[PDB]
Write a protein that binds this ligand. Structure first.
Ligand code: A1BR0
Ligand code: ZN
Length: 139
């Protein structure tokens, strides 16, 4: 579990969205596994605007923060699941690191702020859904 709270917005994994998120929907994209909903209270997470390829992520399955090197956002094939058929997930970044289902929602951060959230993983790898291109979250 996990989410990003910036201004009057809440960013979560699309496959974990609640009834409230769908009733206060701003934007959603199945190919990115993202959903953004409106909030009554102001959020104070800083979103990063960079091309950093190193950072630190939180892993709930180990109660630990781990440093990682990660790839540039791209189209990566994701195996069929209970939430989606077999497809290409866009804007995804991979790193060598531990993850298990339950770690989705964990935040990835560099020195400039929030880079993205855990969305896929396995085989000794972890996948992060990038958010640095969504400039409307700040304005
Ligand atoms: N983004 C997707 O399509 C997900 C949906 C849930 C299923 N999924 C996975 O990769 C499962 C998983 C295994 C090991 C580590 C992690 Cl963090 C995860 Cl999410 C694809
Ligand atoms: Zn950065």
């Amino acid at each position: 579990s996990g989410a990003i709270y910036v201004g009057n917005y809440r960013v979560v994994n699309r496959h974990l969205a609640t009834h409230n998120d769908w009733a206060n929907l701003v934007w959603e994209d199945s190919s990115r596994d993202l959903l953004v909903s409106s909030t009554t209270a102001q959020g104070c997470d800083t979103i990063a605007r960079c091309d950093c390829q190193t950072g630190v992520y939180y892993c709930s399955s180990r109660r630990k923060h781990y440093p990682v090197s990660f790839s540039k956002p791209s189209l990566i094939f994701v195996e069929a699941s209970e939430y989606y058929p077999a497809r290409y997930q866009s804007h995804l970044m991979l790193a060598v690191g531990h993850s298990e289902p339950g770690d989705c929602g964990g935040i990835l951060r560099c020195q400039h702020g929030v880079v993205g959230i855990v969305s896929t993983g396995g085989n000794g790898l972890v996948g992060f859904a990038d958010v640095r291109d969504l400039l409307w979250l700040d304005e």
